[PDB]
Amino acid sequence: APDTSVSNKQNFSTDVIYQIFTDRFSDGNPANNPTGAAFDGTCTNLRLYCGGDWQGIINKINDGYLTGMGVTAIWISQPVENIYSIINYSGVNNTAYHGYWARDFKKTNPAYGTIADFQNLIAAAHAKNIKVIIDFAPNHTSPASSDQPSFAENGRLYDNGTLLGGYTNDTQNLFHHNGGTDFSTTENGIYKGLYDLADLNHNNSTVDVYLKDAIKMWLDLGIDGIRMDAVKHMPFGWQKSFMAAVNNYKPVFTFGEWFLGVNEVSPENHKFANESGMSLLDFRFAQKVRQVFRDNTDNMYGLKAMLEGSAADYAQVDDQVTFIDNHDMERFHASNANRRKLEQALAFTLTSRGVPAIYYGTEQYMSGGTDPDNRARIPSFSTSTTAYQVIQKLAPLRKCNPAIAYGSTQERWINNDVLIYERKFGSNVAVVAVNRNLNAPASISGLVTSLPQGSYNDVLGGLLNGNTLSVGSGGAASNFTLAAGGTAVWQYTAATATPTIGHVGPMMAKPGVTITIDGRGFGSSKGTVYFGTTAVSGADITSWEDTQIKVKIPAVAGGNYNIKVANAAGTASNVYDNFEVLSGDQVSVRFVVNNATTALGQNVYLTGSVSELGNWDPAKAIGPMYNQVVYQYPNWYYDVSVPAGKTIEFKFLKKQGSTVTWEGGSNHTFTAPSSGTATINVNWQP
Ligand SMILES: OC[C@H]1O[C@H](O[C@H]2[C@H](O)[C@@H](O)[C@@H](O[C@H]3[C@H](O)[C@@H](O)[C@@H](O)O[C@@H]3CO)O[C@@H]2CO)[C@H](O)[C@@H](O)[C@@H]1O
Numbered sequence: 242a243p244d245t246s247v248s249n250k251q252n253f254s255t256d257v258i259y260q261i262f263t264d265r266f267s268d269g270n271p272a273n274n275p276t277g278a279a280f281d282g283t284c285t286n287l288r289l290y291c292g293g294d295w296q297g298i299i300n301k302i303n304d305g306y307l308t309g310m311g312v313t314a315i316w317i318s319q320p321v322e323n324i325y326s327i328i329n330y331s332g333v334n335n336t337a338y339h340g341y342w343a344r345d346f347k348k349t350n351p352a353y354g355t356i357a358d359f360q361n362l363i364a365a366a367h368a369k370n371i372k373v374i375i376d377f378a379p380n381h382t383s384p385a386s387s388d389q390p391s392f393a394e395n396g397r398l399y400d401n402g403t404l405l406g407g408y409t410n411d412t413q414n415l416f417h418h419n420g421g422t423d424f425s426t427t428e429n430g431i432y433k434g435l436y437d438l439a440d441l442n443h444n445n446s447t448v449d450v451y452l453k454d455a456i457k458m459w460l461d462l463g464i465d466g467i468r469m470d471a472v473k474h475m476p477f478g479w480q481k482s483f484m485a486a487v488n489n490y491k492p493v494f495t496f497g498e499w500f501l502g503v504n505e506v507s508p509e510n511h512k513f514a515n516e517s518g519m520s521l522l523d524f525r526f527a528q529k530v531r532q533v534f535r536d537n538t539d540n541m542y543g544l545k546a547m548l549e550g551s552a553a554d555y556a557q558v559d560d561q562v563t564f565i566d567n568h569d570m571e572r573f574h575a576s577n578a579n580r581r582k583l584e585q586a587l588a589f590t591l592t593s594r595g596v597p598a599i600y601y602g603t604e605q606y607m608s609g610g611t612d613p614d615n616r617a618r619i620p621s622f623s624t625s626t627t628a629y630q631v632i633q634k635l636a637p638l639r640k641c642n643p644a645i646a647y648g649s650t651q652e653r654w655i656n657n658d659v660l661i662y663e664r665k666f667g668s669n670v671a672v673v674a675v676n677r678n679l680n681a682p683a684s685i686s687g688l689v690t691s692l693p694q695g696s697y698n699d700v701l702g703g704l705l706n707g708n709t710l711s712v713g714s715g716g717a718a719s720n721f722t723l724a725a726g727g728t729a730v731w732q733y734t735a736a737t738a739t740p741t742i743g744h745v746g747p748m749m750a751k752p753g754v755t756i757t758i759d760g761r762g763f764g765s766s767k768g769t770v771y772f773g774t775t776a777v778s779g780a781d782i783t784s785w786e787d788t789q790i791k792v793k794i795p796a797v798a799g800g801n802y803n804i805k806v807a808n809a810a811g812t813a814s815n816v817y818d819n820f821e822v823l824s825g826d827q828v829s830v831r832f833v834v835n836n837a838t839t840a841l842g843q844n845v846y847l848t849g850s851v852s853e854l855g856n857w858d859p860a861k862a863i864g865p866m867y868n869q870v871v872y873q874y875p876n877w878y879y880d881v882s883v884p885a886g887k888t889i890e891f892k893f894l895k896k897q898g899s900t901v902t903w904e905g906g907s908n909h910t911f912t913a914p915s916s917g918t919a920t921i922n923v924n925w926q927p
């Protein structure tokens with residue numbers, strides 16, 4: 242099947258995601274609606290259930306609301322069973338309508354539907370070429386208090402009906418008892434509870450194995466993607482071992498939520514996106530777009546810096562999921578603001594790099610402050626709004642113009658309020674012009690593009706006051722005026738003759754797993770796939786066509802490789818780097834080193850005899866290690882993903898900048914468990 246097929250679970254760059262808050266979308270089956278003080282059919286009390294369910298989503302997929310909009314993928318609320326308790330926070334009642342208060346990850350939330358309804362959702366969705374993504378929050382269970390075992394459900398966790406434990410009297414140690422986080426540091430936000438939510442302890446083998454078996458159930462139900470909740474609050478080492486469990490079984494596009502505020506650029510956020518096995522929601526992109534198009538606290542020069550910077554910090558910037566708002570932010574559209582601002586933001590996002598995600602109701606101009614006002618029931622299913630049509634015109638372009646799905650980004654014209662960028666991929670080009678100034682037109686002269694000589698009509702058809710572009714020799718565009726609030730999209734598409742890799746997924750897996758390589762110009766007959774210098778051809782290449790290649794990862798040593806293909810004629814393609822081959826199945830192990838004193842700015846790291854530990858290369862050491870919560874300096878600890886059942890040699894080192902100080906003595910040695918977790922405690926050797 243082609244790279245744009247609905248069956249492509251490893252690539253979402255040609256798709257447009259529609260985020261649905263199940264409960265606030267459509268009540269297709271009133272028979273499963275909660276009752277009593279936990280229900281409000283008028284949906285005036287935004288903290289109780291309103292009735293939205295999966296049957297309702299199915300109806301909206303069948304009457305053409307979503308398909309007519311150009312949507313090709315939906316992201317729904319966590320499907321697992323939540324608590325049934327109505328929590329009272331100072332007078333106001335609260336329900337798990339949002340789906341983030343899990344009690345059993347192997348069952349469904351009755352309010353949304355049964356396992357059967359879920360299967361029908363997958364069938365109905367796929368039938369209309371729509372992929373299904375589920376939210377998954379393995380960081381915690383539900384609101385709990387060790388003091389009030391009566392409060393809510395004490396954060397109790399069940400394994401398909403069978404009770405495993407509660408937050409109070411947690412002798413089994415399923416949860417963390419370190420207090421609550423203040424978001425002061427990364428370590429603090431990971432090992433301490435998020436708000437009043439029972440923080441799960443992934444170092445516990447029962448919890449580790451339980452969550453990995455639970456996710457496999459949903460993979461077998463046929464989901465196409467996964468949005469990991471609060472990935473910023475779980476051990477990165479464990480999450481990497483979790484992504485390996487997913488990728489070594491049934492690979493699916495996964496992205497996590499790492500919240501970033503305005504003007505916040507975190508090096509840790511980047512490192513997590515580059516080597517954890519999953520991508521991330523692009524908060525850096527979302528916050529900047531808000532500053533330039535919504536609040537006007539930054540100009541087009543700041544938007545340009547964000548685009549150029551992110552393309553350098555993210556190894557696979559094309560996997561980051563973009564958006565302009567969500568369930569944790571004020572609706573982009575302010576009730577009194579001009580609508581053209583939301584429209585331009587949509588046009589910008591839909592034609593930019595990454596995977597576009599639209600929050601439900603955006604196309605209907607919904608307004609609303611922070612939670613829960615930003616989660617009101619969608620007011621109507623009208624297709625006559627301007628925003629609906631903008632999405633309708635641009636969404637399909639990610640499927641037919643690979644320049645938008647996999648293309649590079651380049652600034653071709655710019656000033657305070659105007660930005661004209663070009664997307665390019667092979668023989669495909671897309672030029673987008675945006676003028677945020679709603680009161681002043683702009684005289685654009687000196688615009689150069691990669692577009693062939695000729696005339697180009699605005700793809701938006703002038704919907705946002707766009708105009709026709711007249712291009713001469715050398716791609717030099719003829720002078721023209723860009724209307725106030727103007728937005729135009731011009732493009733050119735043609736067959737690509739040279740093999741061009743536009744995407745690869747998964748980006749981390751053990752030998753034997755099949756990966757998907759998408760692009761253009763691969764030819765119709767089998768060629769060769771290279772993992773570094775190792776050539777792969779013949780049977781191990783399960784399928785090969787012009788836009789997609791499926792090949793099994795060769796049994797090579799664990800490490801980082803560059804992917805490269807060649808058609809039957811032997812013409813090589815571009816290189817796609819940062820692909821990681823695991824040493825085998827993974828397990829999460831906690832390393833602890835005692836009496837490792839250091840000087841300010843100097844930190845302790847871990848290195849070892851396997852690729853998962855950097856193969857003795859200080860530049861690839863694991864760390865910095867933690868020393869505040871679970872263990873305190875001079876004792877350091879860190880959760881690492883390592884090959885299961887392998888005997889590993891390792892040493893710790895202190896690093897200040899690129900200056901390394903090795904641990905004395907011989908290597909420490911140990912054999913990782915074949916399953917579950919383990920904790921290695923050793924002393925620093927002088
Ligand atoms: O927690 C993260 C933090 O860890 C490391 O800091 C430790 C220092 O390396 C260690 O020397 C010690 O700090 C002492 C200072 O050296 C001393 O001058 C005086 O200020 O007392 C300090 C007592 O803490 O302990 C800290 C651990 O808190 C690492 O160097 C840091 O870069 C890192 O941010």
Ligand SMILES: OC[C@H]1O[C@H](O[C@H]2[C@H](O)[C@@H](O)[C@@H](O[C@H]3[C@H](O)[C@@H](O)[C@H](O)O[C@@H]3CO)O[C@@H]2CO)[C@H](O)[C@@H](O)[C@@H]1O
Nearest residue numbers: 850856857858890891892902903904905906907908909
């Ligand atoms: O590079 C692969 C090897 O990496 C590791 O070797 C470390 C040692 O663990 C560490 O003690 C240090 O050894 C130095 C030694 O202390 C010093 O007396 C001598 O003069 O130089 C040695 C270094 O050349 O540094 C090395 C890394 O260079 C790992 O322990 C080992 O198993 C790997 O083969």
Ligand SMILES: OC[C@H]1O[C@H](O[C@H]2[C@H](O)[C@@H](O)[C@@H](O)O[C@@H]2CO)[C@H](O)[C@@H](O)[C@@H]1O
Nearest residue numbers: 652653654655656657685686687688689
């Ligand atoms: O002409 C090539 C030139 O085009 C663009 O420069 C624009 C500039 O962005 C505008 O602010 C204004 O000054 O007109 C210029 C063209 O005359 C590109 O930004 C620039 O990189 C490129 O060299």
Ligand SMILES: [Ca+2]
Nearest residue numbers: 270274292294
């Ligand atoms: Ca219902």
Ligand SMILES: [Ca+2]
Nearest residue numbers: 431440474475
């Ligand atoms: Ca946590």
